[PDB]
Structure formats: structure tokens, C-alpha cells
Paper text:
Here, we show that Pseudomonas aeruginosa OprC is an outer membrane, TonB-dependent transporter that is conserved in many Proteobacteria and which mediates acquisition of both reduced and oxidised ionic copper via an unprecedented CxxxM-HxM metal binding site. As indicated by the successful structure solution, OprC contains a single bound copper and shows the typical fold of a TBDT, with a large 22-stranded β-barrel occluded by an N-terminal approximately 15 kDa plug domain that, like in other TBDTs, completely occludes the lumen of the barrel. The copper binding site comprises residues Cys143 and Met147 in the plug domain and His323 and Met325 in the barrel wall. The CxxxM-HxM configuration, which coordinates the copper in a tetrahedral manner, is highly unusual and has, to our knowledge, not been observed before in copper homeostasis proteins.
We next asked whether OprC also binds Cu(I). Since it is challenging to maintain copper in its +1 state during crystallisation, we used silver (Ag(I)) as a proxy for Cu(I) and determined the co-crystal structure of WT OprC in the presence of 2 mM AgNO3. This is possible because the protein used for crystallisation only had approximately 60% copper occupancy. Data were collected at 8,000 eV, at which energy the anomalous signal of copper is very small (0.6 e−, compared to 4.2 e− for Ag). Strikingly, and in sharp contrast to Cu(II), the anomalous map of OprC WT crystallised in the presence of silver shows not one but 3 anomalous peaks. The first, very strong peak (Ag1; 23σ) is located at the same site as in OprC crystallised with Cu(II) and is coordinated by the same residues (Cys143, Met147, His323, and Met325). The other 2 silver sites have lower occupancies (Ag2, approximately 10σ and Ag3, approximately 10σ) and are each coordinated by 3 methionines of the methionine track (Met286, Met339, and Met343 for Ag2; Met341, Met343, and Met348 for Ag3), as seen also, for example, for Cu(I) in the Ctr1 copper transporter. Only 5 Met residues form the 2 sites (Met343 is shared between the two), and this, combined with the fact that the track has 11 or 12 methionines, suggests that there are more than 2 metal binding sites. The distance between Ag2 and Ag3 is approximately 6.5 Å, i.e., large enough for 2 metal ions to be bound simultaneously, consistent with the fact that Ag was present at approximately 10-fold excess during crystallisation (approximately 0.2 mM OprC and 2 mM Ag). While direct measurement of the affinities of the methionine binding track sites would be challenging, the structural data suggest that the methionine track provides at least 2, and possibly more, binding sites for Ag(I), and, by extension, for Cu(I).
Numbering used by the authors: 66 to 444, 450 to 723
Amino acid sequence: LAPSVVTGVAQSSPLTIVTNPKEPRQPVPASDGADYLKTIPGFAVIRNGGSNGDPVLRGMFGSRLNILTNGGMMLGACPNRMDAPTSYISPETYDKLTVIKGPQTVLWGPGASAGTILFEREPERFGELGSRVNASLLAGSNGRFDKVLDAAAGNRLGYLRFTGNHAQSDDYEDGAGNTVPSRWKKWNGDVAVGWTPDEDTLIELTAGKGDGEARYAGRGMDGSQFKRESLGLRFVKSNVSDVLEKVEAQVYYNYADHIMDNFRLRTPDPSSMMPMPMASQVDRRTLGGRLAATWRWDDFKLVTGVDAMRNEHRARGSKYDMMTDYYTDADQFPWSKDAVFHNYGAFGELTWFAAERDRLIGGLRLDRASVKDYRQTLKHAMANPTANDTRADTLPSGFVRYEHDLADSPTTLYAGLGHAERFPDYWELFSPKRGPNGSVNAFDKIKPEKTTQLDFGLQYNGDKLQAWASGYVGVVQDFILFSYREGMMGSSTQATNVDARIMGGELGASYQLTGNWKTDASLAYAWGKNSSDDRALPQIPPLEARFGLTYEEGDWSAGSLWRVVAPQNRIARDQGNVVGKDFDKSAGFGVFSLNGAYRVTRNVKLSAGVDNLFDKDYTEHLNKAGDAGFGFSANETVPEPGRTFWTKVDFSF
Ligand SMILES: [Ag+]
Ligand SMILES: [Ag+]
Ligand SMILES: [Ag+]
């Protein structure tokens, strides 16, 4: 019953991790989706600045991860992914974060090669007329200050719910006393209206908005705006029949409006490729829906449904007349549409409870994906050879999983085969300046990515000791890979298709030593190989381990955490994704941190922490290369923060 601070999350069900994001996390997160996944073994984060990291799962990056918010899909618009999906998510506003590792589900959209991530909010359960609030404030080093509010009121028949947050930090300092360009600010406000005409019905309308700004240690530009707009409507019916346990319909609309420039959060580097004030605006409009029925009968559960999705991308730039140094901002020009994606899918999952200690699950889905290139020209300007052209493909995926509970031990074993196929996304088709060799551009030739992967592992849910492991081996056909070349002026990317082998796993245990002392540990490993070129895959996080120690008496608790990270010597220089490249073997490091928590009232709880107690100067292997405009050298990557203190108070009524 004693309050805690979360240093790491364990796996509770096979392949499935579930956590409540509202608890204090020990490497305290910069109020961003990617930082709440640091806590779960298998995740790493490309650091861009102080916030807005790009999450990497088992070495896979980007659209290989399926990031859902209330079953809806929010996607960002920057061509260089300053606004990864998780930039718009504020996790402590959500109630449940769950992660399914590997291509082992079909219920939540196409192409979840690496895994799916589901932030949800469970609906209110009001009986009498009533209300509830929970809130939190947080203050830390470097001007870090966060407010979070969650309030609802309603009764048997419906409810109003408000969720909001405001969060900011100024530039942090690394372990050497250098201050890192990394100031950020974020806010969100979202409302939900729910109507529950009887206990077998739920209709809910959601709407919300958010904005932010972020300085980027790399990049060469900063993000001055991250406008989000979201509209959602869903519909749940329970127990409509004896076999038809549930029917869920849902429709959602998301809009991202991003602005990047070099004069609002920095001053234009007078000796770069951008000495002139320049901004670029992009937006992304996303409309999509789901409809699914769950059938339960005998020893079988069956979920069948269809989903659909459209999304569109547009952009406009600034202009700088140079011999009259007059600046025309981007809002003075029209939008140029440049891409439209469509997807329609149909899916089903079947669970056979072969009684007792045996479970067998299989799913399939078939997807029709299509894109149209709307760029009339390229970037001064030249013709686009694929203007108005279209591409489509029909892509099937599916999986089988078997689960076995043992006789003696409280042990579950499991193994699964999964095949997943993913249509290339906006960044793989539109951001590279060159496609495969012999191609007119990326849009024309980049093939879908096809992943076949074997997942297996076990859980020991004993008393005193809980343990879990999950491994994976797989091959990827036509893995989409970026290469960087230096043609004198500027850097130029090239997307290609290669074949890859991948493997790895995570394991962890927590032992309850006494009634007061618990210890736990985790290990995460990833390995990747480009078979086409016989060399390592780029941007693969090195071997990582975490050891925690926690004492809890009555109302209070104290924790320690050691994070130790191996060097990464398997690299692929000048290859990577759309965001970063490999360049140098990384050094290992260890980082130590302390936290404490104390329940004052049944409504008020306190916590505090020191991150990086020993002020270690360290950089992660994945982090982006720092920009020549600031104090960063040649492919030196942005360092991690130095010692930081934080304190937090949680309220609940
Ligand atoms: Ag941008
Ligand atoms: Ag620029
Ligand atoms: Ag310019």
C-alpha cells in the first residue's frame, strides 16, 4: 500500500506491458510520449533536445511502431520528424498505457511491425450524481514546472470530463557544465462528453487542442509551433446478443499544424547554409475510423472488424528577398498539397481457450493501401517526375500464438509466429532526395516492408519473486533504410530497400526480499544486420541494464536506480533513418538516481528525486548529431542532462 516511484515497468501478460502513466517516474519524463516509454525495457529514445524524442523499439523506429491515442491515430507533419507522434501525447493526461511487442496483433491498424502502443482513457463510472479531481504539480532544476488537471462530473446517465496540462523547461546543462539548446513548452486541453443511456450503452464525444515549442540541439531549425486539433466520436454496445458481447464503432479527426524556423528560438547562424530568416510551415490532416464486433461463446472469443484511414500533408515556406532584406512569412503564401494516403483494412482475431492452462490465438488482416503524390514541383525549383501519380498495394498480415501454463509452477510459456507487411509512409516516400539507384525518385520505387518474426518467452508470477523474459528472431524483407552522402553542399538522403535479420530480447525480475525491501532488474538487447550489404543495421541501441532497490515502510518509500549501458561497436556509418545516421562507436556509461515518496493524506502524496546523482557526462548512441551553429563539433551528438532535482505533489478527490 506504500507509495512508489516508477524506475521500470514489468511485463504482466505474454508480450504485453500495462502501466498507469499518472505515477512518478524516476528518470523524470519531459512530459512527452517517448519519455514515458524509456521506463519499459526494449525502448530507447533519439534525443533531439530537451523534449520530443523519437521512440525506438527493439531497434525499430518510426512507423514500424503503431502509436494509438484513444484508438485514434495522430501523425505529425515535419518532413524531418521534429514532431514524432509521441510529441503530441501528454501521458499523464491518459489513464492506461499498454504495449504489445512484436507483430502479434491485428486489431489496431496496418503494419505494426515492431509493436503497438495504446494510450487510453477508461470512461467514467458514475452512479449517483458526483465528481472527481486528480491533479499534480512538478518543479525541478532548470526552470522545469508542470501542471496537470483531470476533473469530471456526471451521474448514471452521462458525464463531462476535462483534461489539461501545462509544461515547460529551460535549457538544461550536461555533465560538463555546458548548457544545451533545449528549452521547451507544451500545453493541452481536451474535453469529453459521455452519454450512458443504460448500462449496456456508451456514446462519447471528445475534442481537444494543444500547442508547443521546442529548441533543437541538432536540426539547424527549431520548432516554434506544434498546434494539434482533435475531434473524436465513439460508440460501444454491450451484450446485444447472447454471443455478441460487444460492438464498438469509432471515428476520429486529427490535425497537426507545425512551424519550424531559425529566428524565433535562436538567432540565424550568420555563417551557415541559412544566414537569412526562414520558416517552413507544414500540416497533416487525419480522418479515420474503426468498427469491430466481439463474439464470445463456448471456449472461443472472436473479434472481427474493418478500419479505414485517410491523411493529407501540405506545406508552405517563407521567402527572403536578399537585396531588399525584406522577409515574407510563410502564412503569406498558399498551401501546396503534396501527399494523400488512404488505407482500408479488415481483420479478425480468434482465441481458443483449450481449457485450463492452454491458450491459442490467431489473427489475420488484409489491407489496401494507396498514396498519391501531389507535388507539382520540387526544391531553385525543378519538375517532379511523379506528379499526380498513384501507387497502391494489397498487403496481408497475421499471427499465431500459443500460450501454456505449467502444472507445478505459476509459470506461463509462450511462442508465436507473426508476419506483418507495411506500406511505406510519408517520410520514406517524400523526404529522401534520392530513391534506389536507377529510380526516378523514392515515391516511384520504394517497396513495402515485409517482416516475419518469431516471438517467445515466459512469465513466473510466483510470490516473493516475479520474473519475465521475451525473445525474438526475425527476418525483414525490403527493410527501408536511409543513407547519407556529402556532395559538397548540404546532406542528401537516399532511401533503399535491403534485407535484414534481427534478433534480441528483454528480461527482468523483481524479488521481494523482506516486507520492506524489494529489488528488481532488467536487461534489454537488440541486434540487427543488413544482409544485402553484409554489415550491421544502423541506429541499434546497445545492451542496457537497470537495477533498482526500494525500501517501503508505512506511508513512505525510498528508491535507488543504476542504469548501465554497454558500448555499441556494431554500427553502419552514414546510414540510419530519416532522423539520424550512425557515425561512431559509442562509449558505455552508468547513471545513478534516488527518489522518495511520502503519502500525506489519502488525497495528497509527495515525491522527489535526484536524476544523475554523480553528474555523469554522457551521450546515448542514438542521439542526434549536434548542430554546427551552437557549440557542437563534427558529428558530436547532443549529450544527456547532468544532475537534476525534481519534486512533485499528486492530488486525488
Ligand atoms: Ag520541423
Ligand atoms: Ag532552414
Ligand atoms: Ag535561406
